[PDB]
Amino acid sequence: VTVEDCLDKVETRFDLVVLASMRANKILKNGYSESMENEKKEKATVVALREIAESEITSEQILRNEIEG
Amino acid sequence: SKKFDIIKISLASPEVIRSWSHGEVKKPETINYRTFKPERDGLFCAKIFGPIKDYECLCGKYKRLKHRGVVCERCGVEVEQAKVRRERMGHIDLVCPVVHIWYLKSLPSRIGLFLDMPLKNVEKVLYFESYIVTDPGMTPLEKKQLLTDEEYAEALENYGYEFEASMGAEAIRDLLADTDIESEIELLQAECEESKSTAKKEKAIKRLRLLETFQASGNKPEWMVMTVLPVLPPDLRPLVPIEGGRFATSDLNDLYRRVINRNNRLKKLLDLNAPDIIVRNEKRMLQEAVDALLDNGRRGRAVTGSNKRPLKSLADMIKGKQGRFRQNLLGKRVDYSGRSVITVGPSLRLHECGLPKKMALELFKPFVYSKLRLGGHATTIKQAKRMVELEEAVVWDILETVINEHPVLLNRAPTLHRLGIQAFEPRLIEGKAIQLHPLVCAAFNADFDGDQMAVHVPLTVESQLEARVLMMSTNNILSPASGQPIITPTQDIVLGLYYITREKEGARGEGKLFSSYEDVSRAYNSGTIDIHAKIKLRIDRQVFDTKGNTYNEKGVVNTTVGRALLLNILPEGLSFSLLNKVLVKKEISKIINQAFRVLGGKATVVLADKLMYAGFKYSTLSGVSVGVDDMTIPDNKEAKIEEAEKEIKQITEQYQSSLITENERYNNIINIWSKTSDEVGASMMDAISKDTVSINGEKKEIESFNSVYMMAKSGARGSYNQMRQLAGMRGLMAKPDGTMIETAITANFREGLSVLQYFTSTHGARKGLADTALKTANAGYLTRRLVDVAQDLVVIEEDCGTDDGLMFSAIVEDGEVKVPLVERALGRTLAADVVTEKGVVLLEAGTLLDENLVELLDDNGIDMIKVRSPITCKTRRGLCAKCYGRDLARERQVNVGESVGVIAAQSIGEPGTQLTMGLPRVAELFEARRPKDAAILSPCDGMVRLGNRDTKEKQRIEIIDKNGHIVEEILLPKSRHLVVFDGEQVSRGDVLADGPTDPHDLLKYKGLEEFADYILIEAQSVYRMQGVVINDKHIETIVRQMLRKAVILDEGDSKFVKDESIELVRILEENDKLRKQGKKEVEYELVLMGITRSSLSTESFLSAASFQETTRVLTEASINSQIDNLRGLKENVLIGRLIPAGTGLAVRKESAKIEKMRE
DNA sequence: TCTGACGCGGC
DNA sequence: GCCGCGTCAGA
């Protein structure tokens, strides 16, 4: 991706990458890969970047997720 | 915490070696000849090192799961995994202690300094040439006395017993053991207390430091001589068999076998009570064998095998380019990598690349297996491999799904800059030829002449996402070194646009009016109108102001048909003015930069892809061709040649009479030939560039449409000099010396040349080809040295908070400004506020300069400003974000965790190869080498005079001699003429001798700022003349590493004038700064060192050892027992740990934030 | 080739 | 206090 859309919410281009990696790992550990949705849709790591671009997930909320796991 | 955060190096005691060794080797036997099995006490013996097979005894009697840790009584071999053999170590007992080769030949040898005696005398004692008295006795002979054998006999007869004079290693070890550090240090300091170090005392300084280091370590001094030597594990030195029924044997094994047998022979001789001379010979041979084993050839000719190649020492393996530190630690050959030929791949996107199907299948074969198992097509790994082998049709679709969103890395053999490695998304394509986007090629600096690229695939989720975020081709648009975009069209794409943009005075459809771009396109499709024809088009669209206000632009503007066609490609918010021009290659780059600065990177990438598509389509329609007729010879060339020949004949007639000197005649002939050649070249340009046609109403000159002129004018390819040679003349040809040959070539390539003329031209081309190949190594070596000096530098804090910076003014060369002050200060924050002559402050301090802000300085005409710099940065071992200011690659303030030093080192190195004369001067400036007879600077301010013996030791009265009577002068040569008057008021640090400036003198006398300004002016002046563009900040960052060492004038708690690190001085000053009171913490003066000298002076031993001189660094570190925290990017890479920069710092900061929420 | 550094031997 | 000879170490 251009990462330019993701940069508006996130700053430095490094915190965004770390947050995306953590979100992707959490999604993979969530059992999301039933194998009926992976073929029809893009990989989880891109999905985390898409969620950051929407801004629905919220960078602050993602840090709260780590404590839960 | 289960993690080792520190690494330390210390000397090894004999007890420690015994603890390390699992077994003792008495006989040198490697393997049974009849059967390839371990010898009972051989170096490959299974009992000490371990079992060859996992959980199997050598006899094989114990081969069951019931016994795993059991040890067979029949054989010494234990039951365990064979991997233990690699980590298992062994020791060899020595009958006579052997002095370590490294310490004795340290150069400076540690043993010689400790004994305070010459190295040659110690070597003579070791060889048994001389006798040294171990015990002083009541006899007058000193303990440190060398006695000749007849002298030794006489001393024994006169005094008999009461004194000992042993010889060889044992005597040296005894002398080391019987030494009192406390007694020696106090007496040595007392000699230091009476300080007379003009000559004799300077040597004594090293001994005190060495004694103090030994006392702090607590390591025994006698440990340097080794009583026992450990044996390296067999796996590190394998004797595995190979095809042809032969076994490869390591060089170390032969040395070990020789040493063991020599030791056995020595023990047998001692047991037999054989003659002393034979025993001495055996002892000397054993010592030589030990020296050869540690490092052969250090003090003697190296021993060689039947091949005659010198054997490889253990020290040799760890050092050198083929050495373990740089060969395997940084070589790290990796799997999942592919090398293939590169194709133009024009249809591909800027972020898309073409990958062969077979290579993709091999690289993603494990991923394909996982998908097949998930699919249920194959229930077993073996079944999946068998189906993959047959290339089943279903496999290709699965591979396409797996690689649909997976990034790949493309790299080239010469990675001069980070831009060379980039990440693209692979799309399966037929053929074995890799396809890459044409625009990305310029950054790669590679061409489709058979060049080969290597592709790497990231397995980790973080790595694959991280590469896409920062390693993607779209992410990199501007050069890291300079703001100018690297994605601009290079060759044909520019030419087609230039051809379409051109206008024709008379064309069909001229004066036609088109309401919209679609109407003009329909007219072109009809083809009734001419593309070069002039038409009026009404255009209404939004425009973005510098302030960012958007205004509507409407009206009727006359435009060429081609410009109207190009109008559709331009995005909204961009004025039609940029398209309304000849659209030369320089114009295209400016348009791309304007789009990126305001529109953004994504809009710029889309515009570049549209321009690339348009240029290829239009260029083919143009069908431009190159022909012999296209090049035109000048009509008046023959007359000019005849006139030049007549002038040469007149000069020859003058010389024959003897009226003119030969040298003057030669110079005149060369000048005449050069002038004639220049005139011929000037004439050729006008005819090709200018075409005269009889248009209606008369005949007028119009710009030529010749293909060669368009290519030269377009600037896509070629240059004026090539056009001059093809339609002009070779003229003067430089010989290997470079002096112009008096005869010149009037021949041209189109007309061809005579055999003699071709032979004269051959030398220059050959010399240039020889120069190009040799220069490649120097540029790489210089870049490596720069990377070593600035490798650890990084940004850790947003603001240092220092208000100290540097003064910036336009660098006028005295003939032109050359560099505008605004361009020099662009992207740089201001250290202090700027006050106008009117007295109204214009800019506040700590404000980053901007292009909009830059206009005010020229408008206010302020020629001088003060801006922050890395040298002025107050952070310890770090760079604040503010001091760097604009990153200059993303048009934003530099983000934290970015390695400025590595980029700065690489950017200076890459441009050097293109420039020839040149690289050596830059290298001398970086090394801070001082020019010979540079000049003389006098610190005291006083009247300058001469008259002190007139013996080449002329001195002047630097002291005033009026208020106080004193003489402050030093001897100087009378050979050079004086630069000072007989009577004058001499100033401190004023030049007294004409000549090159000395870099060391400026820092101590002119201060840091003057030296920094001089270095920047010299480096920029050298780079700009060649036309290479380098940011000033990149040069300054390397300079900051150059000054980390200062001399401490006052040692409140520290040492004296001995060089110390600035970081150590500041922390020590801080510790005593408020620890009790003031305590006179320190007084220091900055010093200048060479980049290599600075890198070797680095605190971390591992970083210094890897760069070079590994043996010397290791020998110094072991005695000091230095404990080193990695504290570096390089240290982490060796341990395979995340570097403290970029993503790694961010992960740590996020982890620190996570801890608080749970806390 | 060379550069220098470091030497360290003559006086 | 120094000339002038030398080692090493990288290219």
Ligand SMILES: Nc1nc2c(ncn2[C@@H]2O[C@H](COP(=O)(O)OP(=O)(O)O)[C@@H](OP(=O)(O)OP(=O)(O)O)[C@H]2O)c(=O)[nH]1
């Ligand atoms: N030809 C061309 N296309 C570009 C260029 N820049 C962007 N695109 C297209 O725009 C789409 C933008 O992809 P994203 O990464 O999701 O958006 P972003 O660029 O804003 O991050 C891409 O779609 P995609 O998922 O890659 O495939 P598609 O949707 O284009 O088929 C890409 O094809 C360019 O310079 N040239």
Ligand SMILES: [Mg+2]
């Ligand atoms: Mg090539």
Ligand SMILES: [Zn+2]
């Ligand atoms: Zn056994």
Ligand SMILES: [Zn+2]
């Ligand atoms: Zn700073």
